[PDB]
Design a protein around this nucleic acid. Structure first.
Ligand SMILES: [Mg+2]
Ligand SMILES: [Mg+2]
Ligand SMILES: [Mg+2]
Ligand SMILES: [Mg+2]
Ligand SMILES: [Mg+2]
Ligand SMILES: [Mg+2]
Ligand SMILES: [Mg+2]
Ligand SMILES: [Mg+2]
Ligand SMILES: [Mg+2]
Ligand SMILES: [Mg+2]
Ligand SMILES: [Mg+2]
Ligand SMILES: [Mg+2]
Ligand SMILES: [Mg+2]
Ligand SMILES: [Mg+2]
Ligand SMILES: [Mg+2]
Ligand SMILES: [Mg+2]
Ligand SMILES: [Mg+2]
Ligand SMILES: [Mg+2]
Ligand SMILES: [Mg+2]
Ligand SMILES: [Mg+2]
Ligand SMILES: [Mg+2]
Ligand SMILES: [Mg+2]
Ligand SMILES: [Mg+2]
Ligand SMILES: [Mg+2]
Ligand SMILES: [Mg+2]
Ligand SMILES: [Mg+2]
Ligand SMILES: [Mg+2]
Ligand SMILES: [Mg+2]
Ligand SMILES: [Mg+2]
Ligand SMILES: [Mg+2]
Ligand SMILES: [Mg+2]
Ligand SMILES: [Mg+2]
Ligand SMILES: [Mg+2]
Ligand SMILES: [Mg+2]
Ligand SMILES: [Mg+2]
Ligand SMILES: [Mg+2]
Ligand SMILES: [Mg+2]
Ligand SMILES: [Mg+2]
Ligand SMILES: [Mg+2]
Ligand SMILES: [Mg+2]
Ligand SMILES: [Mg+2]
Ligand SMILES: [Mg+2]
Ligand SMILES: [Mg+2]
Ligand SMILES: [Mg+2]
Ligand SMILES: [Mg+2]
Ligand SMILES: [Mg+2]
Ligand SMILES: [Mg+2]
Ligand SMILES: [Mg+2]
Ligand SMILES: [Mg+2]
Ligand SMILES: [Mg+2]
Ligand SMILES: [Mg+2]
Ligand SMILES: [Mg+2]
Ligand SMILES: [Mg+2]
Ligand SMILES: [Mg+2]
Ligand SMILES: [Mg+2]
Ligand SMILES: [Mg+2]
Ligand SMILES: [Mg+2]
Ligand SMILES: [Mg+2]
Ligand SMILES: [Mg+2]
Ligand SMILES: [Mg+2]
Ligand SMILES: [Mg+2]
Ligand SMILES: [Mg+2]
Ligand SMILES: [Mg+2]
Ligand SMILES: [Mg+2]
Ligand SMILES: [Mg+2]
Ligand SMILES: [Mg+2]
Ligand SMILES: [Mg+2]
Ligand SMILES: [Mg+2]
Ligand SMILES: [Mg+2]
Ligand SMILES: [Mg+2]
Ligand SMILES: [Mg+2]
Ligand SMILES: [Mg+2]
Ligand SMILES: [Mg+2]
Ligand SMILES: [Mg+2]
Ligand SMILES: [Mg+2]
Ligand SMILES: [Mg+2]
Ligand SMILES: [Mg+2]
Ligand SMILES: [Mg+2]
Ligand SMILES: [Mg+2]
Ligand SMILES: [Mg+2]
Ligand SMILES: [Mg+2]
Ligand SMILES: [Mg+2]
Ligand SMILES: [Mg+2]
Ligand SMILES: [Mg+2]
Ligand SMILES: [Mg+2]
Ligand SMILES: [Mg+2]
Ligand SMILES: [Mg+2]
Ligand SMILES: [Mg+2]
Ligand SMILES: [Mg+2]
Ligand SMILES: [Mg+2]
Ligand SMILES: [Mg+2]
Ligand SMILES: [Mg+2]
Ligand SMILES: [Mg+2]
Ligand SMILES: [Mg+2]
Ligand SMILES: [Mg+2]
Ligand SMILES: [Mg+2]
Ligand SMILES: [Mg+2]
Ligand SMILES: [Mg+2]
Ligand SMILES: [Mg+2]
Ligand SMILES: [Mg+2]
Ligand SMILES: [Mg+2]
Ligand SMILES: [Mg+2]
Ligand SMILES: [Mg+2]
Ligand SMILES: [Mg+2]
Ligand SMILES: [Mg+2]
Ligand SMILES: [Mg+2]
Ligand SMILES: [Mg+2]
Ligand SMILES: [Mg+2]
Ligand SMILES: [Mg+2]
Ligand SMILES: [Mg+2]
Ligand SMILES: [Mg+2]
Ligand SMILES: [Mg+2]
Ligand SMILES: [Mg+2]
Ligand SMILES: [Mg+2]
Ligand SMILES: [Mg+2]
Ligand SMILES: [Mg+2]
Ligand SMILES: [Mg+2]
Ligand SMILES: [Mg+2]
Ligand SMILES: [Mg+2]
Ligand SMILES: [Mg+2]
Ligand SMILES: [Mg+2]
Ligand SMILES: [Mg+2]
Ligand SMILES: [Mg+2]
Ligand SMILES: [Mg+2]
Ligand SMILES: [Mg+2]
Ligand SMILES: [Mg+2]
Ligand SMILES: [Mg+2]
Ligand SMILES: [Mg+2]
Ligand SMILES: [Mg+2]
Ligand SMILES: [Mg+2]
Ligand SMILES: [Mg+2]
Ligand SMILES: [Mg+2]
Ligand SMILES: [Mg+2]
Ligand SMILES: [Mg+2]
Ligand SMILES: [Mg+2]
Ligand SMILES: [Mg+2]
Ligand SMILES: [Mg+2]
Ligand SMILES: [Mg+2]
Ligand SMILES: [Mg+2]
Ligand SMILES: [Mg+2]
Ligand SMILES: [Mg+2]
Ligand SMILES: [Mg+2]
Ligand SMILES: [Mg+2]
Ligand SMILES: [Mg+2]
Ligand SMILES: [Mg+2]
Ligand SMILES: [Mg+2]
Ligand SMILES: [Mg+2]
Ligand SMILES: [Mg+2]
Ligand SMILES: [Mg+2]
Ligand SMILES: [Mg+2]
Ligand SMILES: [Mg+2]
Ligand SMILES: [Mg+2]
Ligand SMILES: [Mg+2]
Ligand SMILES: [Mg+2]
Ligand SMILES: [Mg+2]
Ligand SMILES: [Mg+2]
Ligand SMILES: [Mg+2]
Ligand SMILES: [Mg+2]
Ligand SMILES: [Mg+2]
Ligand SMILES: [Mg+2]
Ligand SMILES: [Mg+2]
Ligand SMILES: [Mg+2]
Ligand SMILES: [Mg+2]
Ligand SMILES: [Mg+2]
Ligand SMILES: [Mg+2]
Ligand SMILES: [Mg+2]
Ligand SMILES: [Mg+2]
Ligand SMILES: [Mg+2]
Ligand SMILES: [Mg+2]
Ligand SMILES: [Mg+2]
Ligand SMILES: [Mg+2]
Ligand SMILES: [Mg+2]
Ligand SMILES: [Mg+2]
Ligand SMILES: [Mg+2]
Ligand SMILES: [Mg+2]
Ligand SMILES: [Mg+2]
Ligand SMILES: [Mg+2]
Ligand SMILES: [Mg+2]
Ligand SMILES: [Mg+2]
Ligand SMILES: [Mg+2]
Ligand SMILES: [Mg+2]
Ligand SMILES: [Mg+2]
Ligand SMILES: [Mg+2]
Ligand SMILES: [Mg+2]
Ligand SMILES: [Mg+2]
Ligand SMILES: [Mg+2]
Ligand SMILES: [Mg+2]
Ligand SMILES: [Mg+2]
Ligand SMILES: [Mg+2]
Ligand SMILES: [Mg+2]
Ligand SMILES: [Mg+2]
Ligand SMILES: [Mg+2]
Ligand SMILES: [Mg+2]
Ligand SMILES: [Mg+2]
Ligand SMILES: [Mg+2]
Ligand SMILES: [Mg+2]
Ligand SMILES: [Mg+2]
Ligand SMILES: [Mg+2]
Ligand SMILES: [Mg+2]
Ligand SMILES: [Mg+2]
Ligand SMILES: [Mg+2]
Ligand SMILES: [Mg+2]
Ligand SMILES: [Mg+2]
Ligand SMILES: [Mg+2]
Ligand SMILES: [Mg+2]
Ligand SMILES: [Mg+2]
Ligand SMILES: [Mg+2]
Ligand SMILES: [Mg+2]
Ligand SMILES: [Mg+2]
Ligand SMILES: [Mg+2]
Ligand SMILES: [Mg+2]
Ligand SMILES: [Mg+2]
Ligand SMILES: [Mg+2]
Ligand SMILES: [Mg+2]
Ligand SMILES: [Mg+2]
Ligand SMILES: [Mg+2]
Ligand SMILES: [Mg+2]
Ligand SMILES: [Mg+2]
Ligand SMILES: [Mg+2]
Ligand SMILES: [Mg+2]
Ligand SMILES: [Mg+2]
Ligand SMILES: [Mg+2]
Ligand SMILES: [Mg+2]
Ligand SMILES: [Mg+2]
Ligand SMILES: [Mg+2]
Ligand SMILES: [Mg+2]
Ligand SMILES: [Mg+2]
Ligand SMILES: [Mg+2]
Ligand SMILES: [Mg+2]
Ligand SMILES: [Mg+2]
Ligand SMILES: [Mg+2]
Ligand SMILES: [Mg+2]
Ligand SMILES: [Mg+2]
Ligand SMILES: [Mg+2]
Ligand SMILES: [Mg+2]
Ligand SMILES: [Mg+2]
Ligand SMILES: [Mg+2]
Ligand SMILES: [Mg+2]
Ligand SMILES: [Mg+2]
Ligand SMILES: [Mg+2]
Ligand SMILES: [Mg+2]
Ligand SMILES: [Mg+2]
Ligand SMILES: [Mg+2]
Ligand SMILES: [Mg+2]
Ligand SMILES: [Mg+2]
Ligand SMILES: [Mg+2]
Ligand SMILES: [Mg+2]
Ligand SMILES: [Mg+2]
Ligand SMILES: [Mg+2]
Ligand SMILES: [Mg+2]
Ligand SMILES: [Mg+2]
Ligand SMILES: [Mg+2]
Ligand SMILES: [Mg+2]
Ligand SMILES: [Mg+2]
Ligand SMILES: [Mg+2]
Ligand SMILES: [Mg+2]
Ligand SMILES: [Mg+2]
Ligand SMILES: [Mg+2]
Ligand SMILES: [Mg+2]
Ligand SMILES: [Mg+2]
Ligand SMILES: [Mg+2]
Ligand SMILES: [Mg+2]
Ligand SMILES: [Mg+2]
Ligand SMILES: [Mg+2]
Ligand SMILES: [Mg+2]
Ligand SMILES: [Mg+2]
Ligand SMILES: [Mg+2]
Ligand SMILES: [Mg+2]
Ligand SMILES: [Mg+2]
Ligand SMILES: [Mg+2]
Ligand SMILES: [Mg+2]
Ligand SMILES: [Mg+2]
Ligand SMILES: [Mg+2]
Ligand SMILES: [Mg+2]
Ligand SMILES: [Mg+2]
Ligand SMILES: [Mg+2]
Ligand SMILES: [Mg+2]
Ligand SMILES: [Mg+2]
Ligand SMILES: [Mg+2]
Ligand SMILES: [Mg+2]
Ligand SMILES: [Mg+2]
Ligand SMILES: [Zn+2]
Lengths: 131, 12, 204, 122, 59, 118
RNA sequence: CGUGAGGGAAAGGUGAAAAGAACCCCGGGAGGGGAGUGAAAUAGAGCCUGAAACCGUGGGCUUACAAGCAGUCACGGCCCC
RNA sequence: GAAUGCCGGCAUGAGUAACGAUAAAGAGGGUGAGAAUCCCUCUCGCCGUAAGCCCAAGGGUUCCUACGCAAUGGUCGUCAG
RNA sequence: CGAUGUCGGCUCGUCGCAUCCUGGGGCUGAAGAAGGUCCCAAGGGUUGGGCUGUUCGCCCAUUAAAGCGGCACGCGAGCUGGGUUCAGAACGUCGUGAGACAGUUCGGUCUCUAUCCGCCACGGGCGCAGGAGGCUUGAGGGGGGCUCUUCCUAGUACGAGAGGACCGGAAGGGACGCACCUCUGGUUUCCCAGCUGUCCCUCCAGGGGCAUAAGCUGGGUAGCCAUGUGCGGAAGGGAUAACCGCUGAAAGCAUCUAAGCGGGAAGCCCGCCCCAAGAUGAGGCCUCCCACGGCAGCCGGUAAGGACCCGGGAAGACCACCCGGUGGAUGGGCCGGGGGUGUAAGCGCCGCGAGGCGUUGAGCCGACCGGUCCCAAUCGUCCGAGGUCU
């Protein structure tokens, strides 16, 4: 018996493979399927991902945004079926895995500490060049 | 209810 | 009443109708009946189920005897389900269809010698304002000269966990017969690798 | 996760700026209040000649919390503060504007007026 | 605390009852297949120095 | 509780315990065979095995890695040049533990030998 | 013991005679076992006599469904005479 | 037979509390009847306006060697004030 | 009085019922809704704050309700020590005074070790007439027992209106309880990184010690966790309380009763969950051993089986329990995956330099899921039936 493989066997039906890779520090647009009575629509949540906590099918990522004067953090499961898509809007360069510290920084301070990740940006335009 | 001590507090 | 032996394998959430549902995966199948308890012979009705194959090098003669009289492979675990009499010679997860509610029994995790706070959710003592070495102590345990004793049953520190626990009316979320899995919604007593019993619920 | 003594930002133009919860109106003995729950609170800071003034004992519905709230779809949301909107006994906003985003859980809790007035619902 | 204390002297019967569990268990020993001397199992024989068939130790 | 926790405490705080295994490693790697108490012995295996595996790698990196625990260039040269080659084909198990038959007089401690393998 | 004035104990007995145990044996030694001395050595120096509490070894009878100031009265079983 | 009597002896509590700063230990090699504890080596840790050094009080051979391990040493002891 | 520690709080309960709520009733100056008043009922529940040392009380905000009492005014070998009993000091007052005052003020030594009973846990022993390995029956115990809002029925019955049901159905909560760790959120004593001073290795580079029993800082697996998740209170059957009747005399009528029969509570019995054959009343089933050598007894070897020892374990203080012991994946290594950390060292290139870029999601890397006999569970030993009698 292999209890791990069993779990991954259960999870396998639900696993996504269509989402783009992003890192903590990247700026991201999550189009999420929302219910609002009595219809359902797509609401876009767009911000920096400050956390990606891994656990296989159970990885989840946290995105931070400041809307209308207030800071908002959203936790999304990486394989939720309620995410329509994710668009990478900017590669940001982190020097640590969790970016909790940007919560106390000015927008200007954040801007400095999260320089655009030129390398993975070049990679982004380097792919997308398709036949 | 407050009634008075009958025994002192124990000393060394 | 119907039931099956199984081991707890682990937990996850799956997605079902835009909802995350916490599940515990259980490997239940397959359980061979190795004896039936009958009113004319035993005075009550049940089925002794076997579970998990065993190295015959480890099974002794009185045990070998029992298995053979039932024409059954040597198994690691023997356990009864009461008032359950399957038509077959073998019980599998398929006796459970999704949507059914079940009762899961397992052996709880053992906390060993547990203080009165962990065990019985006592308040313990203050951590300041003069508290003297009593921060986790249970307080008074009685009265005075009347009754001059302590009640049988007084909640006190002592071993806690590693005991039979049944949680009831859990949903069967899915069942994967080709791998002998059962998917139950919520939490189940005990550690991974822990033997558990799964019975149809007694609630209505 | 709001309880008595908790300070809340007020997210409207009632004139209040800071309320301190003195009760969570939810059963015999609720320990915490979250998005969509109504509290009774004391006005601790106001601005001159508002509807409400310092000292008043008003009702409000929580619309933002710093402790993240969980959703049946497996997600969560969390705000920079704990905020509330002051209401009347009919659960109607006493102000005429509400500022900053509010939690979507308000809609299903029957605070449609406030949900509407909000600049964003997350 | 208030300094608890024995209320009554323990009887010869009762102290000895307490000690009904105090007997030593003799050392469990087995012959060393090399030199037939008696030693604890799963230890290197302290007489010839052999364990698992080979010489391991200078005794 | 202690549910599924790996690592003896050996009644030492963090830095003493670390020092303990290191000094043992220096002595094992030096004399090829030492005698300790059974618990230190069993715990010394993996600590040393890892160090031997790095010696089996041979690279400058792995040398600088081992130096963090062993600290002695000569001792490490012995490790890399004479010891590690003996294990080129052996897949783990570079150490063994066999229990002695007699306890310490002064405190009754059960003893064991730990040696590098052939 | 007290700075001091001052307070202030415990502790006797081998044998007639040292004849106070050569020598051998186990043991690092202490101790013991033989040999020897003696009327006597459980008079062997930790020595006359050697009570009692207290500790232990061996044997007889007895005890793990039972209620106690522990005894007493009766009967029965077992052991001994 | 009692005086919370006096003197002494021996019990109970009990193989229990404790073994006196949480600066810290590990291995190898000696020695010896016997070694966690004595010597030597290497590694590790602690003090460094001290936990090092030098005076004065006070103590009085405790100093240095050799030979010892009954007792003293809170364990051990081959070591030692 | 050769000592029965004394108010209040805390902690932990437990009982009573003259019942605060919830359930069931009768009467009502009971239209409905909502009250009053009495009866039955102790199963559960009975909130958070301000003031005072307070008990109490008043007040704020709620609530189904914010019940009253007993237990040495329950509980100081369980804690507190604010109050009241000491020594200090002052004020008012009384006294020539020393001092005093059910008058006030500020301060003021609360004792590591549980023998017996009792309590919570856990073993050892012997017994359960053959000896054993498993699986069970449940005598008898314990646990639990709460409750609100909204919607539908229906703006209906009832009312002029205001207001607004019974019965029946549906959803959603608060507090409590048991388990659990997928998620959320904590811890994670060395799993990774960054930083300072100093000493050191080896000069640079790269490192190690120490700064706490982690030097500091940012993160963090498994585990153990709640703030997170699942689920529970029931349903149902039975017998009842007050109370309501059917039939019905004594008493041509009447009468719930004297014969007899119905209805009827969150309460009582069962039902749910857990313990349980030391239940000496020691039960039941399945399976294994067997008809030993010597003189209901003894000794001696065995049978089936057990223990010893060992490798370990979400088992655990020791013990016990559980697994495994080479015909083996038990721990340790090693390998693969997960996971954390977040791009090592070395070199190259750019810059006067601090650095930066590339190699590179690299290097390192506890516990998590696995594989692999490389290391160690070597080799063994000791117990252990012969079945009493009607
Ligand atoms: Mg496995
Ligand atoms: Mg898993
Ligand atoms: Mg497979
Ligand atoms: Mg995946
Ligand atoms: Mg995957
Ligand atoms: Mg600027
Ligand atoms: Mg590039
Ligand atoms: Mg005292
Ligand atoms: Mg599905
Ligand atoms: Mg039946
Ligand atoms: Mg039956
Ligand atoms: Mg049936
Ligand atoms: Mg079971
Ligand atoms: Mg604890
Ligand atoms: Mg705890
Ligand atoms: Mg608990
Ligand atoms: Mg408290
Ligand atoms: Mg606390
Ligand atoms: Mg105190
Ligand atoms: Mg104190
Ligand atoms: Mg304290
Ligand atoms: Mg008391
Ligand atoms: Mg009594
Ligand atoms: Mg247990
Ligand atoms: Mg339970
Ligand atoms: Mg059951
Ligand atoms: Mg349900
Ligand atoms: Mg605002
Ligand atoms: Mg004001
Ligand atoms: Mg007001
Ligand atoms: Mg104390
Ligand atoms: Mg005593
Ligand atoms: Mg006595
Ligand atoms: Mg006595
Ligand atoms: Mg006693
Ligand atoms: Mg005796
Ligand atoms: Mg006793
Ligand atoms: Mg051998
Ligand atoms: Mg702990
Ligand atoms: Mg483990
Ligand atoms: Mg461990
Ligand atoms: Mg381990
Ligand atoms: Mg460690
Ligand atoms: Mg251990
Ligand atoms: Mg310790
Ligand atoms: Mg300790
Ligand atoms: Mg210790
Ligand atoms: Mg130590
Ligand atoms: Mg340190
Ligand atoms: Mg050597
Ligand atoms: Mg490893
Ligand atoms: Mg080092
Ligand atoms: Mg040993
Ligand atoms: Mg041993
Ligand atoms: Mg020995
Ligand atoms: Mg010793
Ligand atoms: Mg003197
Ligand atoms: Mg003197
Ligand atoms: Mg003198
Ligand atoms: Mg004399
Ligand atoms: Mg004479
Ligand atoms: Mg004379
Ligand atoms: Mg000799
Ligand atoms: Mg000699
Ligand atoms: Mg000597
Ligand atoms: Mg002699
Ligand atoms: Mg002699
Ligand atoms: Mg003679
Ligand atoms: Mg003669
Ligand atoms: Mg004569
Ligand atoms: Mg003689
Ligand atoms: Mg003699
Ligand atoms: Mg005599
Ligand atoms: Mg004599
Ligand atoms: Mg004489
Ligand atoms: Mg004499
Ligand atoms: Mg004598
Ligand atoms: Mg005598
Ligand atoms: Mg005797
Ligand atoms: Mg009886
Ligand atoms: Mg009897
Ligand atoms: Mg008796
Ligand atoms: Mg008794
Ligand atoms: Mg009596
Ligand atoms: Mg009698
Ligand atoms: Mg007298
Ligand atoms: Mg006397
Ligand atoms: Mg006395
Ligand atoms: Mg006297
Ligand atoms: Mg005396
Ligand atoms: Mg004594
Ligand atoms: Mg002991
Ligand atoms: Mg004791
Ligand atoms: Mg103790
Ligand atoms: Mg101790
Ligand atoms: Mg000391
Ligand atoms: Mg002392
Ligand atoms: Mg010490
Ligand atoms: Mg210490
Ligand atoms: Mg230190
Ligand atoms: Mg120590
Ligand atoms: Mg030596
Ligand atoms: Mg020699
Ligand atoms: Mg020594
Ligand atoms: Mg010695
Ligand atoms: Mg040494
Ligand atoms: Mg020493
Ligand atoms: Mg020492
Ligand atoms: Mg060395
Ligand atoms: Mg210092
Ligand atoms: Mg200095
Ligand atoms: Mg200094
Ligand atoms: Mg000097
Ligand atoms: Mg002098
Ligand atoms: Mg002197
Ligand atoms: Mg001298
Ligand atoms: Mg000389
Ligand atoms: Mg000595
Ligand atoms: Mg000595
Ligand atoms: Mg000696
Ligand atoms: Mg001498
Ligand atoms: Mg000594
Ligand atoms: Mg001392
Ligand atoms: Mg000597
Ligand atoms: Mg000397
Ligand atoms: Mg000297
Ligand atoms: Mg008195
Ligand atoms: Mg007294
Ligand atoms: Mg008295
Ligand atoms: Mg209080
Ligand atoms: Mg307390
Ligand atoms: Mg308190
Ligand atoms: Mg409190
Ligand atoms: Mg009571
Ligand atoms: Mg009560
Ligand atoms: Mg009470
Ligand atoms: Mg009344
Ligand atoms: Mg009231
Ligand atoms: Mg009512
Ligand atoms: Mg009522
Ligand atoms: Mg009424
Ligand atoms: Mg009415
Ligand atoms: Mg009316
Ligand atoms: Mg009316
Ligand atoms: Mg009345
Ligand atoms: Mg009344
Ligand atoms: Mg009344
Ligand atoms: Mg009543
Ligand atoms: Mg009640
Ligand atoms: Mg009651
Ligand atoms: Mg009550
Ligand atoms: Mg209160
Ligand atoms: Mg205040
Ligand atoms: Mg208060
Ligand atoms: Mg009060
Ligand atoms: Mg009153
Ligand atoms: Mg008052
Ligand atoms: Mg008043
Ligand atoms: Mg009401
Ligand atoms: Mg109140
Ligand atoms: Mg009242
Ligand atoms: Mg009360
Ligand atoms: Mg009372
Ligand atoms: Mg009273
Ligand atoms: Mg009291
Ligand atoms: Mg009271
Ligand atoms: Mg008391
Ligand atoms: Mg006290
Ligand atoms: Mg008190
Ligand atoms: Mg007492
Ligand atoms: Mg206590
Ligand atoms: Mg005061
Ligand atoms: Mg004063
Ligand atoms: Mg006057
Ligand atoms: Mg005057
Ligand atoms: Mg006058
Ligand atoms: Mg007076
Ligand atoms: Mg006075
Ligand atoms: Mg006064
Ligand atoms: Mg007074
Ligand atoms: Mg007075
Ligand atoms: Mg007054
Ligand atoms: Mg006044
Ligand atoms: Mg005062
Ligand atoms: Mg003061
Ligand atoms: Mg005072
Ligand atoms: Mg006071
Ligand atoms: Mg005080
Ligand atoms: Mg003790
Ligand atoms: Mg005791
Ligand atoms: Mg105690
Ligand atoms: Mg007693
Ligand atoms: Mg007891
Ligand atoms: Mg047991
Ligand atoms: Mg037992
Ligand atoms: Mg027992
Ligand atoms: Mg026993
Ligand atoms: Mg018997
Ligand atoms: Mg039998
Ligand atoms: Mg078994
Ligand atoms: Mg059995
Ligand atoms: Mg059995
Ligand atoms: Mg039966
Ligand atoms: Mg029963
Ligand atoms: Mg009973
Ligand atoms: Mg309608
Ligand atoms: Mg309507
Ligand atoms: Mg109307
Ligand atoms: Mg209307
Ligand atoms: Mg109608
Ligand atoms: Mg009308
Ligand atoms: Mg209306
Ligand atoms: Mg209804
Ligand atoms: Mg509900
Ligand atoms: Mg309760
Ligand atoms: Mg967990
Ligand atoms: Mg996990
Ligand atoms: Mg977690
Ligand atoms: Mg987390
Ligand atoms: Mg964290
Ligand atoms: Mg490391
Ligand atoms: Mg460090
Ligand atoms: Mg440094
Ligand atoms: Mg140097
Ligand atoms: Mg450098
Ligand atoms: Mg460096
Ligand atoms: Mg380090
Ligand atoms: Mg250093
Ligand atoms: Mg350090
Ligand atoms: Mg230092
Ligand atoms: Mg600090
Ligand atoms: Mg840390
Ligand atoms: Mg975390
Ligand atoms: Mg973790
Ligand atoms: Mg919670
Ligand atoms: Mg449900
Ligand atoms: Mg019913
Ligand atoms: Mg009925
Ligand atoms: Mg009538
Ligand atoms: Mg009639
Ligand atoms: Mg008639
Ligand atoms: Mg009748
Ligand atoms: Mg009658
Ligand atoms: Mg009836
Ligand atoms: Mg009727
Ligand atoms: Mg109910
Ligand atoms: Mg059971
Ligand atoms: Mg049984
Ligand atoms: Mg039985
Ligand atoms: Mg049973
Ligand atoms: Mg009975
Ligand atoms: Mg019988
Ligand atoms: Mg039986
Ligand atoms: Mg069976
Ligand atoms: Mg035979
Ligand atoms: Mg014969
Ligand atoms: Mg056999
Ligand atoms: Mg074991
Ligand atoms: Mg455990
Ligand atoms: Mg163990
Ligand atoms: Mg033991
Ligand atoms: Mg076994
Ligand atoms: Mg074997
Ligand atoms: Mg092999
Ligand atoms: Mg393995
Ligand atoms: Mg392995
Ligand atoms: Mg990764
Ligand atoms: Mg780089
Ligand atoms: Mg690099
Ligand atoms: Mg340049
Ligand atoms: Mg250059
Ligand atoms: Mg690349
Ligand atoms: Mg790598
Ligand atoms: Mg890896
Ligand atoms: Mg891990
Ligand atoms: Mg995995
Ligand atoms: Mg593994
Ligand atoms: Mg092998
Ligand atoms: Mg294989
Ligand atoms: Mg035998
Ligand atoms: Mg007959
Ligand atoms: Zn041998």
């Amino acid at each position: 018996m292999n209890r791990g493989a069993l779990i991954k066997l259960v999870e396998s039906r639900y696993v996504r493979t269509d989402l783009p890779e992003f890192r903590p520090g990247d700026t991201v647009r999550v189009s999420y399927k929302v219910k609002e009575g009595n219809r359902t629509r797509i609401q876009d949540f767009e911000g920096i991902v400050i956390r990606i906590r891994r656990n296989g099918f159970n990885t989840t990522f946290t995105v931070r945004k400041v809307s209308y004067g207030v800071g908002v953090e959203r936790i999304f499961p990486l394989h939720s079926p309620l995410i329509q898509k994710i668009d990478i809007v900017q590669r940001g360069r982190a020097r640590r895995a969790k970016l909790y510290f940007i919560r106390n920084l000015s927008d200007r301070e954040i801007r400095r500490k999260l320089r655009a990740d030129r390398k993975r940006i070049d990679q982004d335009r380097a792919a997308e060049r398709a036949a | 209810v407050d009634k008075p001590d009958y025994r002192p507090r124990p000393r060394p | 009443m119907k039931g099956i032996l199984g081991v707890k394998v682990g937990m996850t959430r799956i997605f079902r109708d835009d909802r995350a549902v916490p599940v515990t995966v259980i490997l239940a199948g397959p359980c061979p009946v190795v004896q039936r308890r009958t009113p004319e012979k035993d005075g009550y009705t049940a089925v002794q189920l076997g579970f998990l194959p065993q190295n015959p090098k480890r099974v002794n003669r009185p045990l070998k005897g029992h298995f053979a009289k039932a024409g059954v492979e040597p198994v690691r675990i023997l356990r009864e389900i009461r008032d359950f009499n399957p038509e077959g010679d073998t019980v599998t997860v398929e006796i459970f269809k999704p949507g059914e509610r079940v009762d899961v029994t397992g052996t709880s995790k053992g906390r060993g010698f547990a203080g009165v706070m962990k065990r019985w959710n006592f308040a313990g003592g203050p951590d300041s304002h003069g508290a003297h070495k009593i921060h986790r102590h249970p307080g008074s345990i009685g009265n005075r000269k009347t009754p001059g004793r302590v009640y049988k049953g007084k909640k006190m520190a002592g071993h806690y966990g590693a005991e039979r626990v049944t949680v009831m009316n859990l949903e069967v979320v899915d069942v994967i017969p080709e791998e002998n899995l059962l998917l139950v919604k919520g939490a189940v007593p005990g550690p991974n690798g822990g033997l558990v019993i799964v019975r149809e619920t007694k609630k209505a | 996760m709001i309880q008595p003594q908790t300070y809340l930002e007020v997210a409207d133009n009632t004139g209040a700026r800071k309320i301190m919860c003195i009760r969570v109106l939810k059963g015999s003995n609720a320990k915490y209040a979250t998005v969509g729950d109504v509290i009774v609170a004391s006005v601790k800071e106001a601005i001159p000649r508002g509807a409400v003034k310092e000292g008043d004992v008003v009702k409000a519905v929580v619309v933002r919390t710093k402790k993240e709230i969980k959703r049946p779809d497996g997600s969560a949301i969390r705000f920079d503060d704990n905020a509330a909107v002051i209401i009347n006994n009919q659960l109607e906003p006493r102000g005429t504007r509400v500022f900053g985003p509010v939690a979507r859980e308000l809609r299903e809790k029957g605070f449609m007026k406030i949900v509407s007035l909000a600049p964003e619902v997350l | 605390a208030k300094h608890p204390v024995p209320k009554k002297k323990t009887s010869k019967a009762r102290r000895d009852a307490r000690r009904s569990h105090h007997a030593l268990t003799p050392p469990t020993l087995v012959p060393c297949p090399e030199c037939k001397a008696m030693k604890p199992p799963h230890t290197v024989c302290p007489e010839c120095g052999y364990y698992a068939g080979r010489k391991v130790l200078e005794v | 509780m202690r549910h599924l926790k790996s690592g003896r405490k050996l009644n030492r705080h963090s830095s003493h315990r670390l020092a303990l295994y290191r000094n043992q490693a220096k002595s094992l790697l030096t004399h090829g065979r030492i005698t300790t108490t059974v618990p230190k012995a069993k715990e010394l295996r993996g600590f040393v095995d890892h160090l031997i595996h790095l010696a089996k790698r041979g690279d400058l990196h792995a040398r600088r890695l081992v130096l963090r625990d062993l600290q002695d260039v000569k001792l490490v040269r012995k490790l890399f040049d004479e010891i590690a080659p003996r294990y080129r084909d052996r897949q783990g198990g570079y150490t063994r533990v066999l229990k002695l038959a007699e306890r310490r007089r002064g405190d009754g401690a059960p003893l064991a030998l730990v040696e590098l393998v052939e």
